[PDB]
Symmetry: C3
Subunit: 32 residues, 3 copies
C-alpha cells in the first residue's frame, strides 16, 4: 500500500515537471 | 495517517490534472 | 518511510502551487489584453 502510494507520488511529480516545462515552452513562444 | 496521505496525493493529482487542462487551453489560444 | 513520503508529497504540493501561479501568468500573457 505504501509502495502503491509511492508510485502515485512519483507519477504526480513527473506530471508536474512536465506541466512546468510546457508552461515555460509556451512563454518562450509568446513573449511579453 | 496513511489515509490522510492518500487523500493529499489524490488532491495533488486533481490539481495537476486541472493545470494540465489549463495549459492545453492556453496552448490552443496561441495555437 | 511514511514521513519521507509525506515530505515528498508536501514538495509535490509546493511544485503544483508554483505551476498554478505560472499558469495564471501565462493566462494573462495569452488572453486579450
Ligand atoms: Cl503527490
Ligand atoms: Cl502541476
Amino acid at each position: 500500500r505504501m509502495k502503491q502510494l509511492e508510485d502515485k507520488v512519483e507519477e504526480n511529480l513527473s506530471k508536474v515537471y512536465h506541466n512546468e516545462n510546457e508552461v515555460a515552452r509556451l512563454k518562450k513562444l509568446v513573449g511579453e
